[PDB]
Amino acid sequence: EVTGSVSLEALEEVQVGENLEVGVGIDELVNAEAFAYDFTLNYDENAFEYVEAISDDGVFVNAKKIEDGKVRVLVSSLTGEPLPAKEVLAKVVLRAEAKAEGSNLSVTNSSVGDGEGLVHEIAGTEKTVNIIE
Question: Is 1-133 assigned to CATH 3.40.50.300?
Answer without folding.
Answer: no
